Amino acid sequence: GMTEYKLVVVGADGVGKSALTIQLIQNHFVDEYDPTIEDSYRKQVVIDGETCLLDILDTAGQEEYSAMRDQYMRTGEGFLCVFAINNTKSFEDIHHYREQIKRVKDSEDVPMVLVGNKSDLPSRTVDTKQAQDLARSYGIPFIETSAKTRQGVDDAFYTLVREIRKHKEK
Ligand SMILES: C[C@H](Oc1ccnc(-c2noc([C@@]3(C)CCCc4sc(N)c(C#N)c43)n2)n1)[C@@H]1CCC[N@H+]1C
Ligand SMILES: Nc1nc2c(ncn2[C@@H]2O[C@H](COP(=O)(O)OP(=O)(O)O)[C@@H](O)[C@H]2O)c(=O)[nH]1
Ligand SMILES: [Mg+2]
């Protein structure tokens, strides 16, 4: 049967979670998508020759640590932790998102990719080296993306699928 991969996109308001998700789903840059909409979206894709079904949860809205929200996030098999390369605060938030993922998955080994979005913009404030080194501290991949130009979009989601596969095979 066709394997389905449940991917969750997390990170600060405004980093481009929805834009990245919609590039994957629609193959179009959407520069405006209601920042409060949290929803999931499926797409069939071929990854290393295997046709699979991606189910992407684009997170949004208020921070809340209820049993219900934990349960919803726990359905994710892998997580994209997204910051914007022109927003230092969004990068400094990453460790909090990673810590909450570890907690809800009750695992130190959750499939995860660090994503530096908005790579098309010249106003960089987070060095690539610092981001690469954070990914190295966590032992996870780092992908540079632009939802505007589609740079890195497949790389981010497909790498996360590969990380889920690796984890399932252990
Ligand atoms: C960086 C923070 O800000 C925000 C703002 C919005 N969201 C968060 C946030 N952290 O983790 C999560 C997710 C969605 C991630 C996946 C796993 C779980 S499990 C659960 N219950 C979740 C929730 N709500 C989450 N989201 N953090 C700073 C610093 C602390 C206070 N704050 C001002
Ligand atoms: N230049 C540029 N703008 C982006 C990119 N991704 C998102 N944006 C803009 O960043 C803002 C927030 O994007 P959005 O997808 O709503 O982020 P979310 O809150 O993380 O879902 C909007 O003004 C988008 O047009 C990108 O890669 N490049
Ligand atoms: Mg959004």
Residue numbers in the entry: 0 to 169
Report text from the authors:
KRAS mutations are among the most frequent gain-of-function alterations found in patients with cancer and their therapeutic targeting has long been a key objective in precision oncology. The KRAS GTPase cycles between an active (GTP-bound) and an inactive (GDP-bound) state. Here we report the discovery and characterization of a non-covalent inhibitor that binds preferentially and with high affinity to the inactive state of KRAS while sparing NRAS and HRAS. The pan-KRAS inhibitor works by preferentially targeting the inactive state of KRAS to prevent its reactivation by nucleotide exchange.
Extensive optimization led to BI-2865, a derivative with a prolinol substituent and a pyrimidine linker, which enabled a direct ionic interaction with E62, as well as a water-mediated hydrogen bond network with the side chain of R68 and the main chain carbonyl of Q61. We established high-resolution cocrystal structures (1.0–1.1 Å) of the pan-KRASi (BI-2865) in complex with several KRAS variants. These showed a conserved binding pocket across variants defined by the α2 and α3 helices, the distal portion of the β1 sheet and the distal portion of the Switch II motif in KRAS. A part of the KRASi pocket overlapped with that occupied by covalent G12C inhibitors, such as sotorasib and adagrasib, with the notable difference that the pan-KRASi engaged the pocket without relying on a covalent tether and did not extend in the P-loop channel near the G12 residue. By comparison, the affinity was 60–140 times lower for KRAS variants loaded with the GTP analogue GCP. Selectivity for the inactive state is probably conferred by the conformation of the Switch II motif (including residues Q61 and E62), which partly occupies the drug pocket in the active state conformation of KRAS. As a result, BI-2865 inhibited the proliferation of isogenic G12C, G12D or G12V mutant KRAS expressing BaF3 cells more potently than precursor 1 with a mean IC50 of roughly 140 nM. Last, the inhibitor attenuated tumour growth in mice bearing KRAS G12C, G12D, G12V and A146V mutant models, without causing apparent toxicity to the mice (at least as determined by monitoring animal weight).
